Write a protein that binds this ligand. Structure first.
Ligand SMILES: Nc1ncnc2c1ncn2[C@@H]1O[C@H](CSCC[C@H](N)C(=O)O)[C@@H](O)[C@H]1O
Ligand SMILES: Nc1ncnc2c1ncn2[C@@H]1O[C@H](CSCC[C@H](N)C(=O)O)[C@@H](O)[C@H]1O
Ligand SMILES: *CCC(=O)Nc1cccc(-c2c[nH]cc2CN(C)CCN)c1
Ligand SMILES: C=CC(=O)Nc1cccc(-c2c[nH]cc2CN(C)CCN)c1
Lengths: 337, 337
């Protein structure tokens, strides 16, 4: 029964709480990437004007002030804007950073800007669907030739064997050795419960969980004309890879990176399991049950990321896949609550 | 609260026990599962050739422990769909003539006879969350023979003031931002305090000795054979407490926890204390709206009541009144997260 005004109310109220901003600012990989991406673009920002789309606690806007921006419009729709105003005033930057309450779509800036900065990425890159707000701002408020930070995003997929899941499935066969009762027969049940659902699971993996070379399946250049329409229809594509070895394959992980223009050279913020952990972790797409793979087992497929039917802020993933000689299968996932 | 009928609430409660994760967590809790295993086997003399009712058999584990103790017949009653898994575990262990899995609530299930003993793991967070105890007492009245065994036989509830070191780290986070990022966010401590302490939810979290500010106090004792215990549960259980603080510390509120006792041999105690080995129950934390500074010998006293919530009688409510030093008496009314 959820309307657009109610959905947006609930979405923004979630960002009014401290925990989510604590988690974001405690993410050093994330927050340093933005700090360093901003400072490397000093030449484009010094004396110039910036729009921070979704300013939160104000931190990115203040990085921009510190890079030399003449003025920063810190726009924020959640009640956290009040915290941002307090932080700006506390750092003595009222004259340089103007906190503006409300959605960026309807906010009134006194001028167009030279640059946009935004941390808009959700789980699986596109959960929350905030990118359309950034693009709306770009069209409405960014000067011709202005700077967009980050400037692009890329999506990757790979087959995985999730070590933690494997222990959880193996648990039931270990009951006998712990307590002298054989519960190995609940393995099928544990599998139905943990793998047989159609939810995207957000969980951090290591490189040892990755079974093949990761494949890029989409590239999003934020300045590309028609990107809004692509997001609505769905982004993605085909992939193919070969497994390294014997492993119980559980499904796929997806992740992203975003890239900032260089000064210097281009800075990449990555959420790969081979790279230092971030609060995004990776987004796991589990098969209904494990499939044993071997060295050189072919894994192919096709994936589309799109907004859900009944909630446009909820990521949906449509997956088609083939593991070795098993027939092609499909699975339709939605982001877990 | 959005209105649900009794039948609907009960259905949602049992459906949550139909999933593997809670049973994995319970069985992985070695402290819990070995307490019952040993509590049952120590009572071999009262169980040899005798009949047992397992109230809320789940995956069937306690019922099988009872059969292993020499029980002649065990009735494994389970209202959640997990009864199907119990039935299969029993068959797989070759115990189908001794352990009989019976589906449905213990309140309406028909046994062929009264029993010599009841075993049940009925304890929720803060002991009484879920309100399962009344079902065990219902089964005692209806099915347990006069002089019959009850496992466990009693429960006790404890309270102590705490300085949560983890919470103190989270509140101090905003003062550490300048060091990492060159942006001063120390002014958000107040906001973080309102968010993390100002709510009225019971927070379930594992503490240790370093978090405890005084000698723990027992505030209630529940003897399961006591007449009219059912009525006490509905009216609320609890009592007054007092203690004296050990040293200087920001007091954040209180922790409560419980233990239950099995008849011996000597008597086995399953404890959920922060000074004892960790369990899945952790402790239940009752935060004040903001920290209060205490000193050595600061008097902390009050009265605490645990009772069903009004809208959901399976949700634990806690009525607390307390006084720290010469601060005025305060009250706070909590509900389980
Ligand atoms: N259309 C919109 N207009 C304004 N703010 C928005 C928005 N959509 C999302 N937001 C806000 O954008 C923020 C994304 S999280 C990023 C917070 C902050 N920039 C930081 O880096 O720490 C949230 O605070 C959310 O409420
Ligand atoms: N009134 C009732 N009748 C039957 N089962 C009940 C019940 N109230 C709760 N239960 C069940 O009691 C169990 C409590 S959890 C304990 C599970 C199992 N005995 C073990 O020790 O691992 C749950 O499976 C729950 O569904
Ligand atoms: C499933 C119904 C329900 O809400 N149960 C509930 C609520 C909170 C936490 C748990 C839980 C989580 N892990 C294990 C358990 C059960 N545990 C508290 C022991 C119960 N006898 C369950
Ligand atoms: C409204 C709503 O449901 N938000 C939403 C949903 C799920 C997770 C999160 C979250 C948890 N920790 C930090 C975040 C934000 N990250 C993802 C970066 C955002 N740019 C936020």
């Amino acid at each position: 029964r959820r309307t657009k005004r109610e959905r947006d109310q609930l979405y923004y109220e979630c960002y009014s709480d401290v925990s989510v901003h604590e988690e974001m600012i405690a993410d050093r990989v994330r927050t340093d990437a933005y700090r360093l991406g901003i400072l490397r673009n000093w030449a484009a920002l010094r004396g110039k004007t910036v729009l921070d789309v979704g300013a939160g606690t104000g931190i990115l806007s203040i990085f921009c002030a510190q890079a030399g921006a003449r003025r920063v419009y810190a726009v924020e729709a959640s009640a956290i804007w009040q915290q941002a105003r307090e932080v700006v005033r506390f750092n003595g930057l009222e004259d340089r950073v103007h906190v503006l309450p409300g959605p960026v779509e309807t906010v009134e800036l006194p001028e167009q800007v030279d640059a946009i900065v935004s941390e808009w990425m959700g789980y699986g890159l596109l959960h929350e669907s905030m990118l359309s707000s950034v693009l709306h701002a770009r069209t409405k408020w960014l000067k011709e030739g202005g700077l967009l930070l980050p400037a692009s995003a890329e999506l990757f997929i790979v087959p995985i064997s999730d070590q933690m899941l494997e222990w959880r499935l193996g648990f039931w066969s270990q009951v006998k050795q712990h307590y002298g009762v054989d519960m190995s027969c609940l393995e099928g049940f544990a599998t139905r419960c943990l793998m047989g659902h159609s939810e995207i699971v957000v969980q951090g993996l290591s490189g040892e969980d990755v079974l093949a070379r990761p494949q890029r399946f989409a590239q999003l250049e934020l300045s590309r004309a028609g990107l809004e329409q692509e997001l609505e229809a769905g982004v993605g594509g085909r992939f193919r890879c070969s497994c390294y070895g014997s492993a119980p394959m559980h499904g796929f992980a997806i992740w992203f990176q975003v890239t900032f223009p260089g000064g210097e050279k281009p800075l990449v913020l990555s959420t790969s399991p081979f790279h230092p952990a971030t609060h995004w972790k990776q987004a796991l797409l589990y098969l209904n049950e494990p499939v044993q793979v071997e060295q050189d087992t072919d894994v192919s497929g096709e994936i589309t990321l799109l907004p859900s039917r009944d909630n446009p802020r909820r990521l949906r993933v449509l997956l088609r896949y083939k593991v070795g000689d098993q027939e092609e299968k499909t699975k339709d996932f939605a982001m877990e609550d």
